[PDB]
Design a protein around this ligand. Structure first.
Ligand code: BR
Ligand code: BR
Ligand code: BR
Ligand code: BR
Ligand code: BR
Ligand code: BR
Ligand code: BR
Ligand code: NA
Length: 129
């Protein structure tokens, strides 16, 4: 599924991601935009052989299992394919764990380079929330 902007905002809010760990809803929508362009089925191979999955491009190196990243961890206890579903529950639940691990949203390189320090509220402007 490819989400619309306000559609994704509403889903993220309903699942309690808004203001989670101090990060306003706009930060999360901006991250999803530059990581996946809002596409739940997005995948990308990393130079080390791991793969990023889903709307928030969660890395099989640490967070999910895909059976082809030898030596990796599965900290959200999920098959990486669960992160590709039309329902974003698994991606949100896993994202709540990543952002809580000490580095905040700096875990998402696209967020740091393209969202951090910008007017992130712009990503939820206009939406009925
Ligand atoms: Br915001
Ligand atoms: Br782009
Ligand atoms: Br794969
Ligand atoms: Br693996
Ligand atoms: Br393969
Ligand atoms: Br959903
Ligand atoms: Br933080
Ligand atoms: Na893994």
């Amino acid at each position: 599924k490819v989400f619309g902007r306000c559609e994704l905002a509403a889903a993220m809010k309903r699942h309690g991601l808004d203001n989670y760990r101090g990060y306003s809803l706009g930060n999360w929508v901006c991250a999803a935009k530059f990581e996946s362009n809002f596409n739940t089925q997005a995948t990308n191979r990393n130079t080390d052989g791991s793969t990023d999955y889903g709307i928030l491009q969660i890395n099989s190196r640490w967070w999910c299992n895909d059976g082809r990243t030898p030596g990796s961890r599965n900290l959200c206890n999920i098959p990486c394919s669960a992160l590709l579903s039309s329902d974003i529950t698994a991606s949100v639940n896993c994202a709540k764990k990543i952002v809580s691990d000490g580095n905040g949203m700096n875990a998402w390189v696209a967020w740091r380079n393209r969202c951090k320090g910008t007017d992130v509220q712009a990503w939820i402007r206009g939406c009925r929330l």
